[PDB]
Design a protein around this ligand. Structure first.
Ligand SMILES: COc1c(C)cnc(Cn2cnc3c(Cl)nc(N)nc32)c1C
Length: 209
């Protein structure tokens, strides 16, 4: 089946090349980065709803949910936030992140700590510290539902998903690397949500059973 595939922009391509298959002592920070993004997406739609309540549509509840899949060996971070359009997935996010991507790359070449990735506005990419593939399913009010996917080899796919569960928001599926399986464990995820994301202004829903 024909899948639309794109080459990442120079700076992102170089940043992902840096992140993958590298030792780091605090790879657990990926969770804080994805939850903060989800909190921000929820805040954007909450803000839009203050002027136009119709923006909430059939999904009036704002949540952040963490789903470990012990059979598929995946960790999912899903929210009912603003979501992303096709143009966001393909170009717009990379355009706004460009300067910060180049600046973080420069900090990393200088011995910079990977934990400050979020201050550079490219925190999503920390998912590649623990995953070898990331699938991103997103539905924004202004577009159809789309699936973005990448194994950080320089390319990414973008496919329309006109049959996904999502009324609005983003679902990030982390296909965990063989040695990063600890992020599927209930205690680890509880301790991790508590350690770095305790006072997030939305419940961090952890699928326990
Ligand atoms: C598609 O994959 C992404 C890319 C290539 C860059 N940044 C983000 C972070 N990000 C940007 N907007 C986002 C929204 Cl609306 N929501 C969430 N959860 N993450 C977001 C994502 C998920």
């Amino acid at each position: 089946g024909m899948t639309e595939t794109f080459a990442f922009q120079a700076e992102i391509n170089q940043l992902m090349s840096l992140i993958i298959n590298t030792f780091y002592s605090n790879k657990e920070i990926f969770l804080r980065e994805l939850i903060s993004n989800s909190s921000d997406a929820c805040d954007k739609i909450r803000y839009q709803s203050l002027t136009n309540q119709s923006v909430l549509g059939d999904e009036p509840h704002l949540r952040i949910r963490v789903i470990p899949d012990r059979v598929n060996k995946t960790l999912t971070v899903e929210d009912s936030g603003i979501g992303m359009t096709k143009a966001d997935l393909v170009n717009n996010l990379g355009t706004i992140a460009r300067s910060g991507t180049k600046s973080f790359m420069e900090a990393l070449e200088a011995g910079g700590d990977m934990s400050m990735i979020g201050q550079f506005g490219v925190g999503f990419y920390s998912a590649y510290l623990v995953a070898d593939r990331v699938t991103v399913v997103s539905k924004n009010n202004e577009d159809d539902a789309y699936t973005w996917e990448s194994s950080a080899g320089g390319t990414f796919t973008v496919t329309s998903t006109p049959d996904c569960d999502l009324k609005r928001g983003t679902r990030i599926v982390l296909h965990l690397k063989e040695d990063q399986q600890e992020y599927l464990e209930e205690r680890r995820l509880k301790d991790l949500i508590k350690k770095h994301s305790e006072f997030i202004g939305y419940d961090i829903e952890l699928m326990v059973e």
